[PDB]
Design brief:
Blueprint: E1 12-14, H1 18-21, H2 24-33, E2 41-44, E3 63-64, E4 68-75, E5 78-85, E6 89-90, H3 91-99, H4 111-121, E7 128-134, H5 155-161, E8 172-176, E9 181-185, E10 192-200, E11 203-208, H6 213-223, H7 225-230, E12 240-242, H8 244-249, E13 255-259, E14 264-267, E15 272-277, E16 281-288, H9 293-299, H10 315-321, H11 326-330
Parallel strand pairs: 1-2
Antiparallel strand pairs: 2-14, 3-6, 4-5, 4-7, 5-12, 7-8, 8-16, 9-15, 10-14, 10-16, 11-13, 11-15
Bound molecules: nickel (II) ion and zinc ion.
Length: about 350
Amino acid sequence: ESETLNPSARIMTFYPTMEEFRNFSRYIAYIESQGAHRAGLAKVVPPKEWKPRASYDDIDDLVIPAPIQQLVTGQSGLFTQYNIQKKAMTVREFRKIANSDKYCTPRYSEFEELERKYWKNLTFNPPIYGADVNGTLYEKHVDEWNIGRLRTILDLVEKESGITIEGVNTPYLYFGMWKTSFAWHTEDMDLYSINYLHFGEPKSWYSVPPEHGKRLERLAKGFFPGSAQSCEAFLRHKMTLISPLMLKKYGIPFDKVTQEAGEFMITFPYGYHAGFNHGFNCAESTNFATRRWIEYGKQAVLCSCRKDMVKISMDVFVRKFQPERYKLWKAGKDNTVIDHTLPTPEAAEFL
Ligand code: NI
Ligand SMILES: [Zn+2]
Protein backbone atom coordinates (compact mmCIF):
# COMPACT_ATOMS: atom_id res chain seq x y z
CA GLU A 1 0.00 0.00 0.00
CA SER A 2 2.79 2.41 0.97
CA GLU A 3 4.91 0.23 -1.27
CA THR A 4 2.85 1.88 -4.01
CA LEU A 5 3.66 5.48 -2.96
CA ASN A 6 6.77 7.00 -4.59
CA PRO A 7 7.67 3.62 -6.18
CA SER A 8 10.76 5.21 -7.70
CA ALA A 9 11.90 6.60 -4.33
CA ARG A 10 12.51 9.90 -6.15
CA ILE A 11 13.20 13.21 -4.40
CA MET A 12 9.85 15.00 -4.06
CA THR A 13 9.17 18.74 -3.84
CA PHE A 14 6.33 20.33 -1.89
CA TYR A 15 4.62 23.70 -2.04
CA PRO A 16 2.53 23.82 1.12
CA THR A 17 -0.07 26.51 1.67
CA MET A 18 0.38 28.76 4.70
CA GLU A 19 -2.35 26.77 6.50
CA GLU A 20 -0.41 23.61 5.75
CA PHE A 21 2.86 25.25 6.77
CA ARG A 22 1.74 26.12 10.32
CA ASN A 23 1.94 22.63 11.89
CA PHE A 24 5.42 21.23 11.33
CA SER A 25 4.97 17.66 12.52
CA ARG A 26 1.65 17.45 10.69
CA TYR A 27 3.13 18.44 7.33
CA ILE A 28 6.05 16.04 7.87
CA ALA A 29 3.56 13.23 8.42
CA TYR A 30 1.72 14.38 5.27
CA ILE A 31 4.74 14.30 2.96
CA GLU A 32 5.41 10.81 4.33
CA SER A 33 1.82 9.83 3.49
CA GLN A 34 2.89 10.82 -0.04
CA GLY A 35 5.98 8.57 0.12
CA ALA A 36 8.54 11.38 0.25
CA HIS A 37 10.58 9.56 2.88
CA ARG A 38 11.41 6.72 0.51
CA ALA A 39 13.79 9.07 -1.24
CA GLY A 40 15.62 9.90 2.04
CA LEU A 41 15.38 13.55 1.04
CA ALA A 42 12.59 16.02 0.18
CA LYS A 43 12.42 19.69 -0.71
CA VAL A 44 9.80 21.92 0.84
CA VAL A 45 9.24 25.35 -0.67
CA PRO A 46 7.55 27.57 1.92
CA PRO A 47 4.74 30.00 0.97
CA LYS A 48 6.18 33.20 -0.52
CA GLU A 49 4.17 35.07 2.11
CA TRP A 50 6.61 33.67 4.69
CA LYS A 51 10.03 34.78 5.96
CA PRO A 52 12.13 33.69 8.98
CA ARG A 53 13.88 37.03 9.20
CA ALA A 54 13.36 40.59 8.02
CA SER A 55 16.95 41.17 6.92
CA TYR A 56 20.44 39.66 6.99
CA ASP A 57 22.57 42.81 7.24
CA ASP A 58 23.68 42.86 10.88
CA ILE A 59 25.58 39.61 10.60
CA ASP A 60 28.89 40.71 9.14
CA ASP A 61 30.04 40.93 12.74
CA LEU A 62 28.87 37.42 13.70
CA VAL A 63 31.86 35.34 14.70
CA ILE A 64 32.65 31.94 13.15
CA PRO A 65 34.64 30.45 16.01
CA ALA A 66 35.91 27.42 14.10
CA PRO A 67 36.28 27.84 10.35
CA ILE A 68 37.29 24.58 8.71
CA GLN A 69 39.62 24.26 5.73
CA GLN A 70 38.59 21.23 3.69
CA LEU A 71 41.45 19.22 2.31
CA VAL A 72 40.38 16.44 0.01
CA THR A 73 42.48 13.49 -1.10
CA GLY A 74 41.54 10.80 -3.62
CA GLN A 75 40.89 9.93 -7.28
CA SER A 76 38.44 8.12 -9.52
CA GLY A 77 35.28 9.18 -7.68
CA LEU A 78 36.54 8.23 -4.19
CA PHE A 79 37.77 10.81 -1.72
CA THR A 80 38.51 11.33 1.96
CA GLN A 81 38.09 14.83 3.32
CA TYR A 82 40.28 16.16 6.11
CA ASN A 83 39.37 19.16 8.25
CA ILE A 84 41.98 21.82 9.00
CA GLN A 85 40.63 24.22 11.56
CA LYS A 86 41.46 27.84 10.91
CA LYS A 87 41.44 30.57 13.54
CA ALA A 88 38.15 32.29 14.24
CA MET A 89 36.82 34.89 11.87
CA THR A 90 33.83 37.11 11.37
CA VAL A 91 31.31 36.65 8.59
CA ARG A 92 32.33 39.65 6.44
CA GLU A 93 35.86 38.24 6.62
CA PHE A 94 34.56 34.88 5.43
CA ARG A 95 32.48 36.48 2.69
CA LYS A 96 35.54 38.44 1.54
CA ILE A 97 37.58 35.25 1.23
CA ALA A 98 34.59 33.48 -0.38
CA ASN A 99 34.10 36.01 -3.15
CA SER A 100 37.84 36.52 -3.60
CA ASP A 101 39.25 35.55 -7.00
CA LYS A 102 40.95 32.48 -5.54
CA TYR A 103 37.82 30.95 -3.97
CA CYS A 104 34.81 32.23 -5.95
CA THR A 105 32.47 30.25 -8.23
CA PRO A 106 33.42 29.43 -11.83
CA ARG A 107 31.30 30.51 -14.80
CA TYR A 108 28.91 27.87 -16.18
CA SER A 109 25.79 27.24 -18.29
CA GLU A 110 23.75 24.28 -17.08
CA PHE A 111 24.06 22.71 -13.61
CA GLU A 112 25.58 19.56 -15.09
CA GLU A 113 28.61 21.71 -15.90
CA LEU A 114 29.11 23.15 -12.41
CA GLU A 115 28.66 19.61 -11.05
CA ARG A 116 31.31 18.17 -13.37
CA LYS A 117 33.68 20.97 -12.31
CA TYR A 118 33.06 20.21 -8.64
CA TRP A 119 34.10 16.59 -9.04
CA LYS A 120 37.07 17.51 -11.24
CA ASN A 121 38.53 20.16 -8.85
CA LEU A 122 37.47 18.77 -5.45
CA THR A 123 41.02 18.04 -4.38
CA PHE A 124 42.42 21.45 -5.50
CA ASN A 125 42.43 24.87 -3.78
CA PRO A 126 40.95 23.73 -0.44
CA PRO A 127 38.05 25.97 0.57
CA ILE A 128 37.06 27.15 4.00
CA TYR A 129 33.70 26.11 5.46
CA GLY A 130 32.05 28.22 8.16
CA ALA A 131 30.61 25.12 9.77
CA ASP A 132 28.88 24.15 12.99
CA VAL A 133 28.17 27.68 14.17
CA ASN A 134 25.87 27.68 17.20
CA GLY A 135 22.85 29.87 16.68
CA THR A 136 19.83 30.79 14.67
CA LEU A 137 18.87 33.48 12.18
CA TYR A 138 15.14 33.17 12.89
CA GLU A 139 13.30 36.18 14.31
CA LYS A 140 12.22 35.44 17.91
CA HIS A 141 8.51 35.37 17.00
CA VAL A 142 8.46 33.18 13.86
CA ASP A 143 6.31 30.16 14.84
CA GLU A 144 6.29 28.25 11.57
CA TRP A 145 9.13 25.80 10.91
CA ASN A 146 11.38 27.49 13.46
CA ILE A 147 14.52 25.35 13.57
CA GLY A 148 15.12 26.57 17.11
CA ARG A 149 11.81 25.15 18.40
CA LEU A 150 10.02 22.66 16.11
CA ARG A 151 8.43 20.88 19.09
CA THR A 152 8.84 17.27 17.93
CA ILE A 153 9.36 14.34 20.28
CA LEU A 154 13.15 14.83 20.05
CA ASP A 155 12.35 17.41 22.75
CA LEU A 156 12.00 14.44 25.11
CA VAL A 157 15.78 14.23 25.39
CA GLU A 158 16.38 17.67 26.87
CA LYS A 159 13.04 17.50 28.71
CA GLU A 160 13.86 14.29 30.57
CA SER A 161 17.63 14.62 31.07
CA GLY A 162 18.52 18.29 30.55
CA ILE A 163 21.04 17.21 27.90
CA THR A 164 21.66 19.38 24.88
CA ILE A 165 23.63 18.14 21.89
CA GLU A 166 24.88 20.96 19.66
CA GLY A 167 23.40 20.80 16.17
CA VAL A 168 21.10 17.91 17.14
CA ASN A 169 18.54 19.39 19.52
CA THR A 170 20.01 22.91 18.98
CA PRO A 171 20.50 24.90 15.74
CA TYR A 172 23.68 25.08 13.69
CA LEU A 173 24.53 27.69 11.11
CA TYR A 174 26.64 26.89 8.07
CA PHE A 175 28.50 29.50 6.01
CA GLY A 176 29.61 27.97 2.74
CA MET A 177 31.71 28.99 -0.24
CA TRP A 178 32.18 27.31 -3.60
CA LYS A 179 33.34 23.70 -3.54
CA THR A 180 32.77 23.28 0.25
CA SER A 181 31.35 19.79 0.83
CA PHE A 182 29.30 17.62 3.13
CA ALA A 183 30.32 13.96 2.98
CA TRP A 184 28.03 10.94 2.74
CA HIS A 185 26.24 10.30 6.04
CA THR A 186 22.95 9.75 7.78
CA GLU A 187 22.11 11.83 10.83
CA ASP A 188 23.21 11.00 14.38
CA MET A 189 21.03 8.17 15.78
CA ASP A 190 19.65 8.09 12.23
CA LEU A 191 17.38 11.03 13.04
CA TYR A 192 15.66 13.41 10.63
CA SER A 193 17.22 16.73 9.79
CA ILE A 194 15.84 20.03 8.54
CA ASN A 195 18.00 22.44 6.51
CA TYR A 196 17.03 26.01 5.62
CA LEU A 197 19.13 27.97 3.14
CA HIS A 198 18.86 31.54 4.48
CA PHE A 199 20.70 33.25 1.62
CA GLY A 200 23.36 33.00 -1.07
CA GLU A 201 24.29 30.57 -3.81
CA PRO A 202 22.61 27.17 -4.05
CA LYS A 203 23.47 23.95 -2.21
CA SER A 204 23.31 20.73 -4.23
CA TRP A 205 22.40 17.38 -2.67
CA TYR A 206 22.70 13.71 -3.49
CA SER A 207 20.60 11.10 -1.70
CA VAL A 208 20.33 7.33 -1.45
CA PRO A 209 16.92 5.78 -0.54
CA PRO A 210 16.88 4.32 3.01
CA GLU A 211 15.76 1.02 1.53
CA HIS A 212 19.06 0.98 -0.39
CA GLY A 213 21.22 2.38 2.43
CA LYS A 214 22.82 -0.95 3.24
CA ARG A 215 24.04 -1.35 -0.33
CA LEU A 216 25.86 2.03 -0.12
CA GLU A 217 27.46 0.89 3.13
CA ARG A 218 28.63 -2.40 1.53
CA LEU A 219 30.21 -0.44 -1.32
CA ALA A 220 31.85 2.03 1.07
CA LYS A 221 33.28 -0.82 3.19
CA GLY A 222 34.76 -2.41 0.06
CA PHE A 223 36.33 0.82 -1.07
CA PHE A 224 37.62 1.74 2.41
CA PRO A 225 38.47 -1.57 4.15
CA GLY A 226 40.89 -0.03 6.65
CA SER A 227 38.36 2.46 7.98
CA ALA A 228 35.67 -0.23 7.99
CA GLN A 229 37.94 -2.47 10.05
CA SER A 230 38.59 0.35 12.54
CA CYS A 231 35.01 1.53 13.05
CA GLU A 232 31.60 -0.07 12.85
CA ALA A 233 30.21 3.11 11.31
CA PHE A 234 33.06 5.02 9.67
CA LEU A 235 30.73 6.98 7.39
CA ARG A 236 29.64 8.86 10.54
CA HIS A 237 33.08 10.48 10.58
CA LYS A 238 31.69 12.50 7.60
CA MET A 239 35.01 12.33 5.74
CA THR A 240 33.93 10.10 2.82
CA LEU A 241 33.00 11.59 -0.55
CA ILE A 242 31.73 9.44 -3.40
CA SER A 243 30.86 10.80 -6.82
CA PRO A 244 27.56 10.02 -8.59
CA LEU A 245 29.42 8.31 -11.50
CA MET A 246 30.89 5.91 -8.94
CA LEU A 247 27.46 5.19 -7.47
CA LYS A 248 26.14 4.60 -11.00
CA LYS A 249 29.09 2.35 -11.78
CA TYR A 250 28.21 0.13 -8.83
CA GLY A 251 24.45 0.20 -9.28
CA ILE A 252 23.60 2.22 -6.18
CA PRO A 253 20.25 3.96 -6.60
CA PHE A 254 20.38 7.70 -5.89
CA ASP A 255 18.80 11.02 -6.75
CA LYS A 256 20.03 14.60 -6.83
CA VAL A 257 18.48 17.99 -6.17
CA THR A 258 19.61 21.57 -5.91
CA GLN A 259 18.46 23.67 -2.98
CA GLU A 260 17.85 27.39 -3.61
CA ALA A 261 17.92 30.27 -1.09
CA GLY A 262 14.67 30.41 0.88
CA GLU A 263 14.08 26.67 0.46
CA PHE A 264 13.93 23.83 3.04
CA MET A 265 15.41 20.34 2.75
CA ILE A 266 14.22 17.44 4.93
CA THR A 267 16.35 14.33 5.37
CA PHE A 268 14.71 11.16 6.69
CA PRO A 269 15.89 8.42 9.08
CA TYR A 270 18.68 6.41 7.51
CA GLY A 271 18.69 8.58 4.38
CA TYR A 272 22.29 8.85 3.21
CA HIS A 273 23.09 12.23 1.73
CA ALA A 274 26.04 14.30 0.56
CA GLY A 275 26.62 17.46 -1.46
CA PHE A 276 28.39 20.76 -1.97
CA ASN A 277 27.79 24.53 -1.96
CA HIS A 278 27.78 26.58 -5.19
CA GLY A 279 29.20 29.68 -3.57
CA PHE A 280 28.89 32.01 -0.62
CA ASN A 281 25.75 31.14 1.38
CA CYS A 282 24.32 30.57 4.83
CA ALA A 283 22.35 27.57 6.03
CA GLU A 284 20.67 26.65 9.28
CA SER A 285 19.89 23.09 10.42
CA THR A 286 19.01 20.83 13.32
CA ASN A 287 17.71 17.30 13.85
CA PHE A 288 14.19 16.26 14.77
CA ALA A 289 12.13 13.14 15.35
CA THR A 290 8.81 11.43 14.71
CA ARG A 291 7.42 8.26 16.28
CA ARG A 292 8.63 6.33 13.28
CA TRP A 293 12.20 7.39 14.10
CA ILE A 294 12.13 5.52 17.40
CA GLU A 295 12.83 2.14 15.85
CA TYR A 296 15.60 3.65 13.74
CA GLY A 297 17.06 5.14 16.93
CA LYS A 298 16.98 1.77 18.66
CA GLN A 299 18.77 0.11 15.78
CA ALA A 300 21.20 2.86 14.66
CA VAL A 301 24.73 1.48 14.27
CA LEU A 302 27.01 4.02 15.94
CA CYS A 303 30.65 5.10 15.60
CA SER A 304 32.66 2.69 17.72
CA CYS A 305 36.02 4.40 17.64
CA ARG A 306 35.49 7.78 19.31
CA LYS A 307 34.53 8.89 22.84
CA ASP A 308 33.20 12.01 21.16
CA MET A 309 30.22 10.81 19.22
CA VAL A 310 26.53 11.46 19.63
CA LYS A 311 24.62 8.77 21.50
CA ILE A 312 21.06 9.40 22.61
CA SER A 313 19.59 7.13 25.29
CA MET A 314 16.57 5.45 23.70
CA ASP A 315 15.10 4.32 27.03
CA VAL A 316 12.65 7.19 27.47
CA PHE A 317 11.28 6.79 23.92
CA VAL A 318 10.75 3.08 24.33
CA ARG A 319 9.04 3.46 27.73
CA LYS A 320 6.67 6.17 26.56
CA PHE A 321 5.95 4.99 23.00
CA GLN A 322 6.67 1.24 23.02
CA PRO A 323 5.64 0.29 26.56
CA GLU A 324 4.69 -3.23 25.49
CA ARG A 325 8.19 -3.82 24.10
CA TYR A 326 10.29 -2.26 26.87
CA LYS A 327 10.92 -5.45 28.86
CA LEU A 328 11.61 -7.31 25.63
CA TRP A 329 13.95 -4.61 24.31
CA LYS A 330 15.87 -4.20 27.57
CA ALA A 331 16.33 -7.98 27.54
CA GLY A 332 17.84 -7.72 24.04
CA LYS A 333 15.07 -9.86 22.56
CA ASP A 334 13.24 -7.22 20.47
CA ASN A 335 13.72 -8.42 16.90
CA THR A 336 11.46 -5.82 15.24
CA VAL A 337 12.36 -5.43 11.57
CA ILE A 338 12.22 -1.96 10.01
CA ASP A 339 10.10 -1.34 6.89
CA HIS A 340 11.58 1.76 5.26
CA THR A 341 8.50 2.25 3.06
CA LEU A 342 5.94 2.77 5.85
CA PRO A 343 5.01 6.39 6.78
CA THR A 344 5.11 7.61 10.44
CA PRO A 345 1.91 6.74 12.44
CA GLU A 346 0.94 10.45 12.84
CA ALA A 347 -0.03 10.36 9.15
CA ALA A 348 -3.02 8.18 10.10
CA GLU A 349 -4.77 11.53 10.32
CA PHE A 350 -4.24 11.72 6.52
CA LEU A 351 -3.98 8.14 5.15
NI1 NI B 1 22.98 15.65 7.19
ZN1 LIG C 1 34.23 5.86 14.32
